[PDB]
Write a protein that holds these residues in place. Structure first.
Motif, short mmCIF file in Angstrom:
data_model
loop_
_atom_site.label_atom_id
_atom_site.label_comp_id
_atom_site.label_asym_id
_atom_site.label_seq_id
_atom_site.Cartn_x
_atom_site.Cartn_y
_atom_site.Cartn_z
N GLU E 57 -15.22 -27.03 43.93
CA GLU E 57 -14.54 -27.58 45.10
C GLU E 57 -14.92 -29.05 45.31
N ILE E 58 -13.95 -29.95 45.12
CA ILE E 58 -14.20 -31.41 45.15
C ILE E 58 -13.14 -32.19 45.94
N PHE E 59 -13.51 -33.43 46.28
CA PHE E 59 -12.66 -34.39 46.98
C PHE E 59 -12.72 -35.77 46.29
N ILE E 60 -11.62 -36.18 45.66
CA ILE E 60 -11.54 -37.47 44.96
C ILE E 60 -11.01 -38.55 45.90
N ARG E 61 -11.75 -39.66 45.91
CA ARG E 61 -11.38 -40.88 46.60
C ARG E 61 -10.25 -41.61 45.89
N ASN E 64 -10.38 -45.08 43.16
CA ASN E 64 -10.90 -44.87 41.81
C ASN E 64 -9.91 -44.19 40.86
#
Lengths: 135, 65, 53, 106, 70, 76, 76, 73, 82, 75, 69
Positions: E57-61, E64
């Motif tokens: 479970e991740i959140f990419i900015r 980038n």
RNA sequence: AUACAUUUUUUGGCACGGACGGGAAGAGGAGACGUCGCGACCCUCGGAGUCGUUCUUGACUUGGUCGCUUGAUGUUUCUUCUUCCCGUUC
């Protein structure tokens, strides 16, 4: 007319033709300049000895014309028209320095004055406005 | 939670604040990087109590259950 | 005789000339030492107390 | 004269040693342990640390009043609000950057 | 006819992969916004086409990001 | 140096200035900006072994490239 | 509005010097400037290579040197 | 301002100006180009006028980098 | 909502600050702008394996400041209130 | 004058061989057909192909390349 | 806010110095407030043309130095 | 005296007796690619200035090459000891 903190604070401050401070019998209380100058002009004063400086990392040019320097306790040092008389009195400059001027000092007329300075202060590249040459 | 960062810093920390820019106030902070002038292999990490963070740094945040 | 004597160069502001001793810094280093965050400033001082005994 | 000479004594475990972190039945075995290769090693490696520990001990004892005073301060500041903490900081600051003698003293 | 934002919207609850300013990613898309920040589940970190680790479970900015792909 | 609140209140002070490239601009702040651009009265770029030195003059300096500013001396 | 911008505008006509992020100094007559420092210049050298009418986008500009006459008046 | 001519034009411009500044600082608080027209010359500007006059009289024909400088108002 | 507000509220704090170029900066935050431009006093610049350089006053820009390392004692919830 | 937006629109209408360059990245390029349009330079480009630049060809699917890292267009 | 005054450079061949020490050439056909450039195509600097017309993004432009006077 | 993050600024394209230093010698730091300097047999040779209108302003123009006989400086690959002298510290 002691060189005082108050004296330094009202002294003309400007960018010269480097940051220079326009300035006495004894050099003292330089702490108050806060190491903010590249050059300090001490011309036409009555200082006897080039000594008494705090740690000043900025200071690269010292114009000390027409004073009474007879003893020495930095890239350019102008000592024209002062009182250095013996070659040995110039020895403390070996520990510094690329531009050196000692004209109009009695020491100038001593035999081998130029060669003595060159060997004892090899870091100097221009001496008395003349290029130190290999020969 | 862990955060990946532009300068190779794995920030394992407890989140306190959050905004539009993804700036963060952090507690229980534990960064992970490697001070290393080549060839060398060292793995270093330091604890910090409280730490503000800027958002441009953040690449990818993640949650390890 | 001592005209250039200045206490602020000996005491930090958080020490208040001997009133307090600043131990927050050491709480930081301590967190770095225990490799966690379960330790609060007050729990750290509680740790220091050991050295009174 | 005391610390490294079995200054810490227990009626049960005997005599504790700062350098080896072990107790000893009687003073006899304690003395014949202070020449052993183990204790030589340790007292030869961890000497500075032991001594520093000890200093921390006695100096903190001499400063008990300051330690307490600060702990108190901590709890106070901690129980402040925002405005309170701010004004307090203001006070510490003023005390810090104020003349040691006021033009209005007796 | 197909703009980007609607495509993005459509691609919610579906597999996606992201390159960066570089390392490839691979995970199921949870949701997206106007700024193109991402939130993914079952994230796998393709270090130049090598799945180094599976984060989950991740959140990419957004800034980038380089590109999105199936 | 004095204990100022903002940059604006310390106008015309001689300023050290760092930029992202690593150069150091020194000179009196004539005028500030919404985006921290600086007008410098007598500007000297100092770059780095040992300090290389260049006198510029009156310089408009863009804030993007500005890192941080420090006070070199008092006025005048 | 920005006073540095104003200064730049004023410098129109004059021979400004101009370094970029790349570190490629130019010198030339400033033809036109905008709020965003989108400078145009004439008769411009480029550190060396001579060139006619360079345009530069302020984003990529680092610092601009203006002549020291503008110090005098009457913008400030 | 004093006008100096008969200067050794082989000195680089920034070195010439810095030695000129150094030499002339002895008389009071203190423009030189290498174009064909202006080479071997310099204008030295002083805050005080008495300083300019003193400089002129005292350094007339002073050997500078090998040549005797000629000074004039 | 805003971290800017929080930052503003943090006044007179002796703090370390970390930049995009990794420079560690020990100083007392006298003020901060709406755009995170930090204004420090009693400042101490150190690099991340070399000697230290101290300064009285530093105005650091908002874009540069990666991480402001906060003080030891701080009530965060209270700060976070409007 | 022909604005950039207009050009983009035209390209979209056409469906032609577009070859995109990457900002601050010399070695790689993209080659496909424009499908989308945005207020910013961002677009969606189906049937894209990553290219290593001549100082061959590589497999790639349908992609939206983000507007900030675009450089060149041609269509 | 204001338009980049490139009406002087309209319908002239320009060296678009672009990001990452690269270059582009070509005759200027259009532009906008972000300084995106629309130009009738030319080579990337030995040399090789790609495209019939080209569009360069605003951010990418270092410089647009005029080839023609 | 009583206000917000998606191309021009700030949400970044960033990152990878004992020490110390300098210089010289002797044994088992070296190669590019650039950029600014000590000498020279060489080359080369000499803000200001003009006008329209009015009691003060608006327009138009304006070191390069060779050595270093051990000059200074980044990228980028590969693999120190001993002796003497001069300076800091304890």
């Amino acid at each position: 007319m002691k060189f005082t903190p108050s004296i330094v604070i009202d002294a003309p401050q400007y960018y010269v033709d480097d940051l220079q401070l326009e300035t006495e019998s004894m050099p003292s209380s330089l702490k108050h300049l806060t190491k903010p100058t590249h050059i300090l002009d001490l011309t036409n004063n009555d200082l006897i000895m080039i000594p008494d400086l705090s740690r000043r990392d900025d200071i690269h040019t010292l114009l000390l014309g027409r004073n009474n320097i007879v003893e020495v306790d930095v890239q350019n040092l102008t000592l024209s028209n002062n009182s250095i008389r013996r070659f040995e009195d110039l020895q403390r400059l070996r520990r510094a320095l690329k531009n050196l001027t000692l004209i109009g000092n009695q020491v100038c007329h001593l035999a081998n004055y130029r060669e003595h300075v060159l060997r004892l202060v090899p870091h100097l590249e221009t001496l008395d406005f003349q290029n130190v040459t290999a020969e | 939670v862990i955060i990946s960062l532009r300068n190779n810093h794995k920030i394992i920390a407890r989140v306190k604040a959050f905004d539009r820019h993804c700036n963060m106030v952090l507690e229980n902070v534990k960064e992970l990087w490697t001070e290393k002038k080549g060839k060398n292999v060292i793995n270093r990490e330091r604890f910090i109590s409280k730490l503000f963070l800027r958002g441009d740094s953040v690449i990818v945040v993640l949650k390890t259950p | 005789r001592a005209r250039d004597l200045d206490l602020n160069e000996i005491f930090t502001r958080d020490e208040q000339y001997g009133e307090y001793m600043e131990l927050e810094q050491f709480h930081s280093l301590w967190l770095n030492v225990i490799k966690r965050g379960d330790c609060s400033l007050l729990q750290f001082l509680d740790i220091l107390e050991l050295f009174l005994d | 004269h005391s610390y490294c000479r079995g200054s810490l004594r227990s009626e049960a475990k005997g005599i504790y040693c700062p350098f080896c972190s072990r107790w000893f039945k009687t003073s006899s075995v304690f003395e014949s342990h202070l020449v052993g290769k183990i204790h030589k090693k340790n007292e030869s490696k961890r000497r500075n640390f032991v001594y520093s520990e000890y200093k921390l001990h006695r100096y903190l004892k001499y400063l008990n009043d300051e330690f307490s005073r600060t702990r108190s301060f901590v709890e106070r500041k901690l129980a402040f609000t925002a405005n309170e903490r701010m004004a307090e900081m203001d006070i510490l600051t003023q005390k810090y950057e104020a003349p040691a003698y006021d033009s209005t003293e007796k | 006819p197909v703009n980007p934002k609607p495509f993005l919207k459509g691609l919610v609850n579906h597999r996606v992969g992201v390159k960066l300013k570089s390392t490839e990613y691979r995970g199921t898309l949870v949701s997206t916004d106007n700024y193109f920040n991402l939130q993914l589940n079952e994230a796998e970190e393709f270090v130049a086409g090598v799945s180094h680790g599976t984060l989950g479970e991740i959140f990419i900015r957004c800034n980038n990001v380089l590109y999105i792909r199936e | 140096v004095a204990h100022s609140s903002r940059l604006a209140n310390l106008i015309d002070y001689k300023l050290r200035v760092l930029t992202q490239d690593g150069r150091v601009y020194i000179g009196q702040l004539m005028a500030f900006d919404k985006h921290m651009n600086l007008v410098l009265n007598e500007c000297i770029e100092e770059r780095v072994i040992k300090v290389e030195k260049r006198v510029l003059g009156l310089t408009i300096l863009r804030g993007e490239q500005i890192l941080s500013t420090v006070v070199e001396d008092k006025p005048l | 509005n920005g006073i540095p911008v104003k200064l730049l505008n004023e410098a129109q006509g004059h021979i400004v010097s101009l370094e970029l992020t790349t570190g490629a100094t130019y010198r030339g007559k400033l033809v036109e400037s905008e709020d965003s420092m989108n400078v145009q210049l004439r008769d411009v050298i480029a550190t060396v290579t001579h060139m006619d009418q360079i345009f530069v986008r302020g984003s990529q500009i680092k610092f601009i040197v203006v002549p020291d006459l503008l110090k005098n008046a009457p913008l400030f | 301002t004093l006008y100096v001519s008969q200067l050794n034009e082989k000195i680089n411009m920034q070195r010439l100006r810095v030695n000129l500044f150094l030499l002339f600082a002895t008389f009071g608080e203190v423009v030189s180009m290498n174009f064909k027209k202006q080479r071997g010359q310099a204008f030295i500007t002083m805050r005080t006028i008495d300083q300019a006059s003193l400089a002129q009289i005292s350094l007339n024909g002073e050997r500078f980098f090998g040549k005797p400088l000629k000074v004039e108002f | 909502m805003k971290l800017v507000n929080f930052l503003k509220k943090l006044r007179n704090e002796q703090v370390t600050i970390e930049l995009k170029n990794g420079t560690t900066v020990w100083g007392t935050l006298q003020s901060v702008s709406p755009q995170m431009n930090a204004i420090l006093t009693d400042v101490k610049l150190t690099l991340p394996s070399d000697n230290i350089a101290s300064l009285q006053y530093i105005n650091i820009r908002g874009n540069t400041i990666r991480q402001i390392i906060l003080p030891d004692s701080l009530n965060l919830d209270s700060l976070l209130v409007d | 004058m022909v604005p950039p937006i207009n050009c983009i629109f035209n390209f979209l209408q056409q469906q032609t061989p577009v070859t995109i360059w990457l900002f601050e990245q010399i070695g790689i390029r993209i080659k496909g057909k424009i499908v989308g349009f945005d207020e910013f330079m961002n677009v969606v480009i189906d049937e894209a192909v990553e290219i290593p630049v001549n100082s061959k060809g590589t497999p790639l699917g349908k992609i939206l390349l983000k507007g900030d890292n675009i450089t060149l267009i041609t269509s | 806010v204001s338009t980049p005054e490139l009406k002087k450079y309209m319908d002239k061949k320009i060296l678009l110095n672009i990001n990452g020490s690269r270059k582009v050439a070509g005759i200027l056909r259009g532009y906008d407030i972000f300084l995106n450039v629309v130009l009738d195509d030319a080579m990337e600097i030995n040399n090789h043309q790609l495209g019939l017309q080209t569009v360069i993004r605003g951010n990418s432009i270092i410089s647009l130095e005029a080839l023609d006077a």
